[PDB]
Design a protein around this nucleic acid. Structure first.
Ligand SMILES: [Mg+2]
Ligand SMILES: [Mg+2]
Ligand SMILES: [Mg+2]
Ligand SMILES: [Mg+2]
Ligand SMILES: [Mg+2]
Ligand SMILES: [Mg+2]
Ligand SMILES: [Mg+2]
Ligand SMILES: [Mg+2]
Ligand SMILES: [Mg+2]
Ligand SMILES: [Mg+2]
Ligand SMILES: [Mg+2]
Ligand SMILES: [Mg+2]
Ligand SMILES: [Mg+2]
Ligand SMILES: [Mg+2]
Ligand SMILES: [Mg+2]
Ligand SMILES: [Mg+2]
Ligand SMILES: [Zn+2]
Lengths: 132, 101, 71, 25, 221, 129, 83, 217
RNA sequence: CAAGUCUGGUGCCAGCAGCCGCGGUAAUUCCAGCUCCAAUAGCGUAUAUUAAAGUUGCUGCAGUUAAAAAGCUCGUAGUUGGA
RNA sequence: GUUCGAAGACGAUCAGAUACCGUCGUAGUUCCGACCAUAAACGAUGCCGACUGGCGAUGCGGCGGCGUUAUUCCCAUGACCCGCCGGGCAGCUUCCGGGAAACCAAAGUCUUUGGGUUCCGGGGGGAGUAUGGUUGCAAAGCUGAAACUUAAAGGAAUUGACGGA
RNA sequence: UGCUUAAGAUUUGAAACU
């Protein structure tokens, strides 16, 4: 069973988080780079680390990741946050308003409104849940 | 100590019910203590209805069923592995077990 | 107490006067046949005459033969 | 003993002690 | 050695800004650091270790003993503290229970018995208090009566300065763990108990977390 | 059934405090209870109440402040001389400062501090603090 | 708390609640001091002075904090009399 | 929150309430929350009161404005709906928010990462934010919650009755409390309308965002 | 419950001990030396007894599982009875 | 006097089974008439009285109500649906409160001790035994001690090892 | 889709604050 340990999982991320631009997609390239971006004592641990790194840069180029902070993707998420439609989605023309909300609207200050397309009250009282 | 609130049964406001026999053993269990399964079952399971429906005379004769209402005692109901003991905190869930397999 | 009236005295006192008899140190010391069946008869010393010298084993963890005198 | 077999042996002793007040009554 | 604080209250104590411990009991702020109390009260701060209690559990190889410790701390006028903590040995455990005793001290209240001359010495009313099946009742006393109590809490009431007090008990007092907590709960209720002198309504002063919010920001986060 | 209404009212005024209520209703109107509430009012433990009159045992609605720890009732009723009232307030009150044993006499219903003024004792009804 | 000559001898006056009138201890780590700001009546800005309120814990965990806030503000002149 | 003609409920906020639907309640009435509800419909939906919505909204922005430091007002949400909302109200003021997965012990255990000592909690919904309403009872903390007609008042301290299920009500009630706290500290004029849209504070489906990439250009 | 891991003998034997407990070939508890303590012209051992005992409970006890509420209603004395 | 079936005989199983397993089977099981008065007769929680939080249900009587459904010729009677009220067996949920704890809208309102009123327990065993009365055809039942003998017997939860679970 | 599967000598454990 080839299951990568937590000592690997913890070092694949801080290397990504600090050298995201310098890393690539080929295994033997970042296999030479982690030797001179990190004090790794041996060779087997080198090839295991870069072997899981090139599995994350494929999972990243397929989608985003939970526990790693990408700055290039922070800019696209920031704009996805900041996306604002142009025309308003609230200031419409027709508001369907029931006669019982018309009542308490009478008991409010604004007694008459503009475009209250009043609708019909639902005859038949059936909203509950059957017992089985 | 006292383990269940009702004592495994439904005798709340009577004082007495009548006894009902099991099927595998003959142990006498009062009715609201018993474990009542309800077994409907065809007379052919899956592969002989193809060889009934071919060798029949009528046009796709619908097969009948076999409606049996069972009972069980406790130690038959457990030794035959219908019910399993549960933890104290997952006793209270009295919804029936699901119907997927 | 359980009854708390103003003139319930013969109920209280004729309830305590029964339930005292179920004590152990009252019944052994006070009236009863313990002073009757005391070998001393309600006193602190007694003379006697020896008739034999015997020994008695000891009970558990212990293992010896203690010494006793039939009087 | 459980308790019921102790209670049963007491009644088998009392049906013997009232009998064993024979010739003596 | 030069304790560096973490919290807002430890920072406000390092700069000698809050002047006593009355503004912590006035506000019920949580004390979450041990070196406040030593910073205020290192002088008359005494200790009386009650009892070492060797409890143990069972495994598949022998048994495992870890010792529990009871420490009663406090001066003789104003404050008391208790601490219980168990570890593998007494050196670590007593040191780790004097901590929780400094972290759990409360103020006591005191009144008179009838005449009102001199200085307050006795308990203002009759209180109670219990843990488990130990029920301790504290009774007020006339002057020079002395501590009428058990040899255990005569030691703990002594560490509050209350010179004249009858006591009572109920239950299985041989458990010193319970019987101490009972006589601690009985004296932690005295500022939660209304007396018809406490009728004049409280003037609401300003919060100290609000009185000193300017200086904290150019001294810490 | 109800052998004492004053004894089912001081418990109905006991169970509204440990909850933390503001106003409560009691079902019978005794003249004893009315002289009792207008004893607790002069010491200001409660607010000003009111009585509701049908042609029956009338009702009472009491407004409650927050200075009322526990109102009680003694059963049965006793006789208390001047050398017993010390041995009741020895062991029925928290301290000698406050608390009020209340007892009827042939002069009227009053507390014990007043019964020392008037040199009078009589039957006890209860205690409140 | 004066003995015979008016000397205040206790070391602090404790707080006191505002709803059920039963005072708050030092260990009560479920007690609130609200702070509600006053507002000028022509603009709608912050004047600078406070209304303060205290609430003890057992009421709070019971769940009746707002009905006391709603009554203390209705009585103190914040919310109009219709509500 | 009243006794004044200035701070009243204006019509463009009323029509944008009847527009989003913060009047449409739930189904089961809670007994602590009777005083805010007008009349149950047929179809069994309770009808809320906008006046008693606005009196509580103004009392929440009074308590918050009176608080001097803006930098110790925490704001917790965990549902997927108002993550964006509680992150831009905190952008407009300077709050220190918490966006999903409230790690426990972060209010009471000193040696954690973000051991914070706040002074006021605002919470989007109590059912699913039942943790910190318990860690409010070990540190002395007031609590604001965006209650519905259905949620309880366990340890909450001032309630604001709203709708909190759809993708529109939470982003609106945060936007209106943003305006009223800015129409309260002297930053923004009251007479003029707020420039940007309260459709910023909504939740977008990860589908609708991928649908507005193709026909945009 | 104040105060010897002192030395020499016996080796589950003889014995101490109000209670837990000691003794089977290195016994701080046995028979003896040395030393040490508490009371001091007085001190221990039995028995009767009161407090401690809210373990007889009027002040002040318990009754689901530990000891504990008659199988069930009726009922004369008794005890207590609305405004 | 069908069926089952103490006692009994028999066939296997087992070292031995006078026991479980299997075939036969009397007394009884059923009915009317005279008796006996005992059960884990258990909710192992006396009866009357109130008092102090909610949430859904279910059952009789009653109070209204959109609306479908049949009677058709419709007020009124039936069936669903949404609410209110009395009391009756119950249920989830909770820091009211208590308790040694499991757990309880009562086992709560109790050292801040007192609403009224019945029966009963005082370490364990000896022992529900002796004797003495008494009801009963008998079996047995109601009242009911001591002598002696012992420092533990017992209730609730925690960990471990253990189970032909 | 179940057969049987009895037994095991008496004794022997204890912790203090600086
Ligand atoms: Mg058991
Ligand atoms: Mg039965
Ligand atoms: Mg009494
Ligand atoms: Mg001695
Ligand atoms: Mg004696
Ligand atoms: Mg007892
Ligand atoms: Mg029993
Ligand atoms: Mg019984
Ligand atoms: Mg019986
Ligand atoms: Mg047969
Ligand atoms: Mg046989
Ligand atoms: Mg028969
Ligand atoms: Mg018969
Ligand atoms: Mg009866
Ligand atoms: Mg006995
Ligand atoms: Mg035992
Ligand atoms: Zn069976």
């Amino acid at each position: 069973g080839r299951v990568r340990t937590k000592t690997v999982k913890k070092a694949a991320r801080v290397i990504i988080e600090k050298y995201y631009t310098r890393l690539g997609n080929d295994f033997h390239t970042n296999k030479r780079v982690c030797e001179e971006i990190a004090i790794i004592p041996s060779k087997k641990l080198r090839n295991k680390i870069a072997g899981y790194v090139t599995h994350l840069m494929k999972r990243i180029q397929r989608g985003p990741v939970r526990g790693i902070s990408i700055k290039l993707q922070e800019e696209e998420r920031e704009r996805r946050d900041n996306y604002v439609p142009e025309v308003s989605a609230l200031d419409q023309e027709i508001i369907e308003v029931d006669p019982d909300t018309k009542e308490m609207l009478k008991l409010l200050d604004f007694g008459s409104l503009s475009n209250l397309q009043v609708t019909q009250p639902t005859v038949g009282m059936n909203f509950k849940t059957p017992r089985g | 100590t006292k383990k269940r609130r009702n004592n495994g049964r439904a005798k709340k406001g009577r004082g007495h019910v009548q006894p009902i026999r099991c099927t595998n053993c003959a142990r006498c269990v009062p009715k609201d203590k018993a474990i009542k399964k309800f077994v409907i079952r065809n007379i052919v399971e899956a592969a002989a209805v193809r060889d009934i429906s071919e060798a029949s005379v009528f046009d796709a004769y619908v097969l009948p069923k076999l409606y049996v209402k069972l009972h069980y005692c406790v130690s038959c109901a457990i030794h035959s592995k219908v019910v399993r003991n549960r933890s104290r905190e997952a006793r209270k869930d009295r919804t029936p077990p699901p119907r997927f397999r | 107490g359980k009854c708390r009236g103003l003139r319930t005295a013969r109920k209280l006192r004729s309830h305590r006067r029964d339930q005292k008899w179920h004590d152990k140190q009252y019944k052994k010391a006070h009236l009863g046949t313990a002073l009757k069946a005391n070998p001393f008869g309600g006193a602190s010393h007694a003379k006697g005459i020896v008739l034999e010298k015997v020994g008695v084993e000891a009970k558990q963890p212990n293992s010896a033969i203690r010494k006793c005198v039939r009087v | 003993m459980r308790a019921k077999w102790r209670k049963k042996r007491m009644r088998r002793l009392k049906r013997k002690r009232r009998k064993m007040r024979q010739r003596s009554k | 050695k030069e304790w560096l604080p973490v919290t807002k209250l430890g920072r406000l104590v390092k700069d000698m800004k809050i002047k006593s411990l009355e503004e912590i009991y006035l506000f019920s702020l949580p004390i979450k650091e041990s070196e406040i109390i030593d910073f205020f009260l290192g002088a008359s701060l005494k200790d009386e270790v009650l009892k070492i209690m060797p409890v143990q559990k069972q495994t598949r190889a022998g048994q495992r003993t870890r010792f529990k410790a009871f420490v009663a701390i406090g001066d003789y006028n104003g404050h008391v503290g208790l601490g219980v903590k168990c570890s593998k040995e007494v050196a670590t455990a007593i040191r780790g229970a004097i901590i929780l005793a400094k972290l759990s001290i409360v103020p006591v209240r005191r009144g008179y018995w009838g005449n009102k001359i001199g200085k307050p010495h006795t308990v203002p009313c009759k209180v109670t208090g219990r843990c488990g099946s130990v029920l301790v009742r504290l009774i007020p006393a006339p002057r020079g009566t002395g501590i009428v109590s058990a040899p255990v809490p005569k030691k703990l009431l002594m560490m509050a300065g209350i010179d004249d007090c009858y006591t009572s008990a109920r239950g299985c007092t041989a458990t010193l763990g319970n019987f101490a907590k009972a006589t601690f709960d009985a004296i932690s209720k005295t500022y939660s108990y209304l007396t018809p002198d406490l009728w004049k309504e409280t003037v609401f002063t300003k919060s100290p977390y609000q009185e000193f919010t300017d200086h904290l920001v150019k001294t810490h986060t | 059934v109800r052998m004492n209404v004053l004894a089912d009212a001081l418990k109905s005024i006991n169970n509204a405090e440990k909850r933390g209520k503001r106003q409560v209703l009691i079902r019978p109107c005794s003249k004893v209870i009315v002289r009792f509430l207008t004893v607790m009012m002069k010491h200001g433990y409660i607010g000003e109440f009111e009585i509701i009159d049908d042609h029956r045992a009338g009702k009472i609605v009491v407004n409650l402040t927050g200075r009322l720890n526990k109102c009680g009732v003694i059963s049965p009723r006793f006789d208390v001389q001047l050398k017993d009232l010390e041995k009741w307030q020895n062991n029925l009150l928290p301290s000698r400062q406050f608390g009020f044993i209340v007892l009827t006499t042939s002069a009227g219903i009053m507390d014990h501090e007043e019964a020392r003024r008037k040199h009078t004792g009589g039957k006890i009804l209860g205690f409140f603090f | 708390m004066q003995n015979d000559a008016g000397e205040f001898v206790d070391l602090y006056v404790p707080r006191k609640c505002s709803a059920s009138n039963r005072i708050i201890g030092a260990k009560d780590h479920a007690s609130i001091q609200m702070n509600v700001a006053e507002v000028d009546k022509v603009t709608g800005r912050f004047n600078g002075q406070f209304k303060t309120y205290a609430i003890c814990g057992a009421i709070r965990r019971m769940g009746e904090s707002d009905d006391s806030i709603l009554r203390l503000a209705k009585a103190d002149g914040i919310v109009s009399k219709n509500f | 929150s009243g006794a004044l003609d200035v701070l009243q409920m204006k019509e463009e906020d009323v029509l944008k309430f009847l527009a989003a639907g913060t009047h449409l309640g739930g189904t089961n009435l809670d007994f602590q929350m009777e005083q805010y509800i007008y009349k149950r419909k047929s179809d069994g939906i309770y009808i809320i009161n906008l006046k008693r919505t606005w009196e509580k909204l103004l009392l929440a922005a009074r308590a918050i404005v009176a608080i001097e430091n803006p930098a110790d007002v925490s704001v917790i949400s965990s549902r997927n709906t108002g993550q964006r909302a509680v992150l831009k109200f905190a952008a407009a003021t300077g709050a220190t928010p918490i966006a999903g997965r409230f790690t426990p012990g972060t209010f009471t255990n000193q040696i954690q990462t973000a051991f914070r000592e706040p002074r006021l909690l605002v919470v989007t919904d109590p059912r699913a934010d039942h943790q910190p309403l318990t860690e409010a009872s070990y540190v002395n903390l007031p609590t604001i919650a965006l209650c519905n007609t259905d949620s309880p008042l366990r340890y909450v301290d001032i309630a604001i009755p709203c709708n909190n299920k759809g993708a529109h009500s939470v982003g609106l009630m945060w936007w209106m409390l943003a305006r009223e706290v800015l129409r309260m500290r002297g930053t923004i004029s009251r007479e003029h309308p707020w420039e940007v849209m309260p459709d910023l504070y909504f939740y977008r489906d990860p589908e609708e965002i991928e649908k507005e990439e193709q026909a945009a250009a």
